């Protein structure tokens, strides 16, 4: 059973090779992006493994199907790049990773908090060059601060437990509260009260019609002046455009993003040789109190191993006719 | 009426000491310049001088301050290596200090250094800022499940241990005098050399003494787990920096986070970027991709600075009432 | 006995003015702080105040200086936008300046900006410093053979033209009053719009006047050769910065080097890195990969600074002898 | 006629494709380095095109020859990486580019001078982050300064003419002086007097047993205190180790390198993910008054076009039996 990987990185080959010790599939790693003019590379390959920056619109799917590809395996949770209606029409099933490792993602959120708080990215750049001066690097103790967790699913809960260990006072909002958050010392309250009370707000709720642009100009103006916002959830949870004016005024003190609404078109590529087209992202990137990582929150060895194991298992399952993590239109 | 001249003043000194002064009403003067032989004259007529660790308090400077009518040297620091204490005692010029820094500020800084090294956040930032959204080389490791060795389980080491326990780390500890709080966190005490061999991350928090001087030397680095992370927020002389180089070059030491460096009082707290760095060892450390150095920044939070100011102004008030506190 | 207080002082001011003072013996005082309403009091009892372009010389500040006994404002700059001149004349407080900067310093800076953009030297440096010795994206172009358009052929434009002729560039020029020296270099005069369409590199050196204000606006940018390089070391208001953005985004403008920016006196000459930059247009320009901005640094050589100091101290001596020079 | 390129960069494909409009060769671009375990890719290819970081030691050559490769074309001037004795033994001819574009290289030297003088690399990094302060950025006028050109071959002469246009006073050293340098206003003098008199020294002499380590600790101590040194010639012209102490003491004011003695093992690769092994280079890279480019001096579109034209012409010539730019043991 042969699998062609498009948009391959060294960390993909390393994780999938190790995970393949219990499958023995024939793995082919192509660096190029999948798109109309590279689809031909998948000719004769039964399975193609794609990431979110690969093009799986109707024209590409038609070409893969005509070329004899029988399964599209996404080594991602997200699938915005896939025309699912077209894949169904073509009889080409799509599988994916249902969720990323909660420790990897929650740890990354905490890392964004600490780097922003202690200005560690700014310090590094100073000391690397022999600037040992400390002006502007003063932070705040996390101990005693109010940390508001929006969405208390697995990642939010994991994040909450870590922040509880720093001695933070935990606040939470979820449509369906759970007792585990309570056992950590967490207090549930209304979203609006969470936003007004929290020193640090971290988004971990699913994206739905109800949470789309949850943090918009109104929600930003509800927050405590100078507060920190972290979004490792999904880009569309926030209206990035509204973050700018809040950062300019000082209303928002800090921002840590691991996701961005336009990301599948932007992230996972070195675009440094060319002007950045997106005015909003370009402006965010400039601020001294903003750190953006390029959907890096699941980028640990363990979390990548989970993605590889899940994806290879999904493929074995399709092979046997077991509906496992299929995405349907 | 107390008048206090601060040398080597930063905006964060002025802010914190002004706020602490709410319950004292001292007359505070903030001079940016360093204290040294030729700036001591600025302290002319000031009965208290407030100094940081990079200020020069050798005999010639003390003797000039005393002649100029200075009667107390207040250090807004725990450290005092720059003070000739014998010469101060000889002159009857008492020297007061801050006994300890905020344990939450310092332990949280150590955890930040961990996370930034693990997730390569400093490297990521510099990519993304320039539109490089590629992720090669940035892969880290989950902290959950890893073994974290705490060397020195005083107040800061204990605070650090609690935090790391909340990540779901397995805690190892070494201290000549173990305590039960570490135990209650799930921590296991063991021999120093066994801690070093087993730990994925090692963090130094023990006091510097003749026994702990160069505790991490080339032999101890070789005893560590290949690829391990070392964090030193304790004291520069706990580590033999020169040995760290070869360990980093070979990959034996996977990561290094330093907030302190041996003789840092000569290097840190100044922008030296306009000139060659004379120290070959520090220059080499700075340019590895898996080393982050902060310039004794671990107590640099608003709350930790407020504690330093409150303590220092209370030290000054106590000296004024004829019952000195925190003399060295 | 002349006493002079300098506001907004840099180490390079102190060095150059101390050396120039060899033939004057004035008493020089260097204050780092900016001049403004609440620091004017520092000039109390000083008969001359020496200011740079970022110092505040609006009426309230002038009126305070005059009351405090200041009798001359000496600007260590050619520009004076920060001075309320009417209010100074009303107060009988004369204002002197430096007429022009060193043409070699400024033209050489413009050529440096060219070369750094062409060869991506700033980008290269940041790679190599971190051990990235890969060359993708750094390919430049030979200057030899290229068309270089000089807009304004005064002293700086002429000096710039000679340098670029030595690279084997083909020189184009626009000036309302052409001169024969440009010709002797091999330069061709032509219409402004024709210069812009033909030139691979365009450099601004003309005076700012009602006619040249926003000389490079969106229409002129569209007339330029696709992919061309623009250099502005002249004056910020020669260009409509806001138009440069869309031109850079589309690739119509291939490169941009700025040493000046409209209203720079509010932005430049200070480390503002600790705070958000409020100016959306400048923030956008800063983050393109093919834009380099220097902060009005084009006269920042030792020799050009010596000329500024020599001129300023001679302006002060001339005012002292009752025969003022370089009054505005 | 089929040509396999190892260590291929986008700028190689772009230049060689354009240059191929008068040859019609079949061009294959492989990104991977040539070495023992990638030589197999050249099986059946008559011509292999290599750069200086490719491994052309005996084991690799034997494998190429056994696989039917009949010519090694180096898209470089240098050939240290080639075991020529082994290539001769194997009957595998080697061709190269005799010299790089003199304008490209001399221009790059001038760019290194100006960036160092005006600290433009340091300025960029400040202003990018909103630091508009000018401390430490003061330079010097080039006008009137003494510029010493060591080696007045084509590149040295080209460099000299450019620096003459800035109004510099030109000093020169060459075993075989020429009148063109004189017509520019240049004065020939002894090497030692050049070194003592010059504000800026630029190396453009060939590397030979006599010029190896020409700038060594002795020559550095002959220079004017605070002077600038530029080496775009060859790495081995200088003893890099001796530069360090001179930079530390302030004896050497500035250094611009486009070449380095260990370079074929270091340059042309992104090594930023790993510690740098070379202590000397690592130390040079740290100094605020050192700029190193990674043998970038011929990296212009025109100069790359010349390399491509020359290399394709060399290949056509070999084909016809015309000895053109052959390298012999």
The answer to whether the CB atoms of B276 and D135 lie below 8 A apart is no
Angle, CA A111 vertex, CA A105 and CA A113 arms, to 5°: 110
Q: Which residue of B has its CA nearest to D287?
A: B276
Resolution to 1 decimal place, in Å: 1.9
Contact A247, A287 (CB under 8 A): yes
D166 and D27 housed in the same domain = no
D13 and D61 housed in the same domain = yes
Question: For the stretch A176-206, what's the b/e string if a residue is b when 16 or more beta carbons lie within 10 angstroms of its beta carbon?
Answer: eeeeebeebebebbebeebbebbbbbbbbbe
> How many domains does chain A fold into?
2
The Cβ-side half-sphere exposure at A233, using a 13 Å CA radius, reads 27
Task: Based on the residue annotation, tell me whether B264 is a catalytic residue of this protein.
Answer: yes
Q: Which residues of B fall within a CB distance of 8 Å from C129?
A: 287
Q: Which residue of B has its CA nearest to A15?
A: B139
Contact A151, A208 (CB under 8 A): no
Structure tokens that stand for C175 in this block: 């000036």
User: Which other chains touch chain B, taking contact as 3+ CB pairs less than 8 Å apart?
Assistant: A, C, D
Best mutation target, D13, D29, D31, D129, to test chain A (most A CBs within 10 A): D129
**DSSP secondary structure of A246-313:** HHHHTSEEEEEES--TTGGGTSSSB-TTS----HHHHHHHH-TTEEE-SS-TT-BHHHHHHHHHHHHH
Please state, in angstroms and rounded to a whole number, the distance separating the CA atoms of residues C3 and C26.
6
Q: Which residues of D fall within a CB distance of 8 Å from C271?
A: 126, 130-133
Contact D284, D243 (CB under 8 A): yes
Burial of C169 (0-12, 13-18, 19+ CB in 10 A): buried
Structure tokens that stand for C126 in this block: 């940041």
User: Which other chains touch chain D, taking contact as 3+ CB pairs less than 8 Å apart?
Assistant: A, B, C
Catalytic site positions of D: 234, 263, 295
Please state, in angstroms and rounded to a whole number, the distance separating the CA atoms of residues A307 and A16.
9
Alpha-carbon distance values, D45 to C185, D5, D62 (Å): 53, 10, 14
C230 and C114 housed in the same domain = yes
A37 is in an annotated binding site: no
The answer to whether the CB atoms of D247 and B276 lie below 8 A apart is yes
Q: Please, which contacts does B23-29 make with residues 24 or more away whose CB atoms are closer than 8 Å?
A: B24/B313, B24/B316, B24/B317, B26/B2, B26/B313, B26/B316, B27/B1, B27/B2, B27/B3, B28/B4, B29/B3, B29/B4, B29/B5
- Which residue in the block uniquely carries the two structure tokens 């990431």? A51
Question: Dihedral (C-alpha) C234, C235, C237, C242: value to the nearest 10 degrees?
Answer: 70
Q: What is the CATH number of the domain that holds A196?
A: 3.40.50.720
A134 and A180 housed in the same domain = yes
C215 and C317 housed in the same domain = no
D37 is in an annotated binding site: no
Give residues with Cβ within 8 angstroms of B23, minimum separation 6: none
> Among D135, D141, D296, whose Cβ lies nearest the Cβ of C301?
D141
**Experimental technique of record:** X-ray
Q: What is the CA radius of gyration of chain B?
A: 21
Q: Which residue of C has its CA nearest to B123?
A: C130
Helix H or strand E segment including C18: helix C11-20
> Which of the following is catalytic: B214, B264, B270, B284?
B264
Give residues with Cβ within 8 angstroms of A183, minimum separation 6: none
Q: Which residues of D fall within a CB distance of 8 Å from C129?
A: 285-286
Other beta carbons within 10 Å of C279? 17
D248 and D122 housed in the same domain = yes
C118 and C234 housed in the same domain = yes
Select from A134, A59, A308, D294 the least CA-distant residue to C139: D294
Tell me how close the Cα of D289 comes to any Cα of chain C, in angstroms: 11
Residues of B with CB under 8 A from a CB of C: 32, 129-131, 287, 289
Give residues with Cβ within 8 angstroms of C26, minimum separation 6: C2, C3, C4, C48, C313, C316
- Edge-first strand order for the sheet with B201-204 is B188-189, B170-174, B147-151, B201-204, B228-232, B253-258, B291-293
Other beta carbons within 10 Å of A10? 14
C167 and C67 housed in the same domain = no
Packing angle, helices A279-286 and A240-249, rounded to 10: 30
The answer to whether the CB atoms of C284 and A282 lie below 8 A apart is yes
Query: Count of CB contacts below 8 A, A vs D?
Result: 4
A106 and A14 housed in the same domain = no
Q: Which residues of A fall within a CB distance of 8 Å from D130?
A: 288
Contact B172, B149 (CB under 8 A): yes
Q: DSSP class of residue A208? A: -
Best mutation target, B31, B33, B123, B130, to test chain C (most C CBs within 10 A): B130
Q: DSSP class of residue D235? A: G
B299 is in an annotated binding site: yes
Structure tokens that stand for C77 in this block: 């700059």
Q: Which residues of A fall within a CB distance of 8 Å from C117?
A: none
C118 and C174 housed in the same domain = yes
Catalytic site positions of A: 234, 263, 295
D234 and D283 housed in the same domain = yes
The answer to whether the CB atoms of B131 and C289 lie below 8 A apart is yes
Tell me how close the Cα of B12 comes to any Cα of chain D, in angstroms: 19
Domain that residue B70 falls in: 1-102+300-328
B283 and B142 housed in the same domain = yes
Best mutation target, B276, B284, B286, to test chain D (most D CBs within 10 A): B276
Alpha-carbon distance values, A325 to A105, A172, D278 (Å): 21, 30, 49
Q: DSSP class of residue D215? A: B
Please state, in angstroms and rounded to a whole number, the distance separating the CA atoms of residues B31 and A27.
67
The alpha-helical segments, DSSP class H, found in chain B are: 11-20, 59-67, 85-90, 103-118, 121-129, 155-166, 180-184, 192-198, 218-223, 241-250, 280-286, 302-320
Q: Phi, psi (5° rounding) for residue D72?
A: -110, 115
Q: Which residues of A fall within a CB distance of 8 Å from B272?
A: 130-132
Tell me how close the Cα of D285 comes to any Cα of chain B, in angstroms: 8
């Amino acid at each position: 059973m042969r699998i062609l990987f498009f948009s391959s990185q060294a960390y993909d080959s390393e994780s999938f090779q190790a995970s393949n010790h219990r499958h023995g599939f024939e793995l082919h790693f192509q660096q190029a992006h999948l798109q109309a003019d590279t689809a031909v590379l998948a000719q004769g390959f039964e399975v193609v493994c794609a990431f979110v920056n690969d093009d799986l619109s109707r024209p590409v799917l038609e070409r893969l199907a005509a070329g004899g590809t029988r399964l599209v395996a996404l080594r991602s949770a997200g699938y915005n790049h896939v025309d699912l209606a077209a894949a169904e029409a073509l009889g080409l099933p799509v599988v994916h990773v249902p969720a990323y490792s909660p420790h990897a993602v929650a740890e990354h959120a905490v890392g964004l908090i600490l780097t922003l708080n202690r200005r560690l990215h700014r310090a590094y750049n100073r000391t690397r060059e022999g600037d040992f001066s400390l002006h502007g690097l003063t932070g705040f103790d996390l101990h005693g601060k109010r940390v508001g967790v929006i969405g208390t699913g697995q990642i939010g809960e994991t994040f909450a437990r870590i922040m509880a260990g720093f001695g933070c006072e935990l606040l939470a909002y979820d449509p369906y509260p759970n007792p585990r958050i309570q056992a950590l010392g967490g207090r549930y309250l209304a979203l609006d009260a969470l936003l007004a009370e929290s020193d640090i707000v971290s988004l971990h709720c699913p994206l739905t019609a109800d949470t789309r642009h949850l943090i918009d100009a109104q929600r930003l103006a509800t927050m405590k002046p100078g507060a920190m916002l972290i979004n490792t959830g999904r880009g569309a949870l926030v209206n990035a455009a509204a973050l700018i004016e809040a950062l300019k005024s000082g209303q928002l003190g800090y921002l840590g993003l691991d996701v961005y609404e336009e990301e599948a078109d932007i992230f996972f590529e070195d675009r440094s040789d060319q002007p950045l087209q997106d005015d909003v992202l370009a402006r965010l990137l400039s601020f001294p109190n903003v750190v953006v990582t390029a959907h890096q929150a699941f980028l640990t060895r363990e979390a990548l191993a989970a993605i590889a194991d899940t994806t290879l298992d999904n493929i074995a399952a399709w092979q046997d006719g077991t509906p496992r993590n299929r995405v349907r239109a």
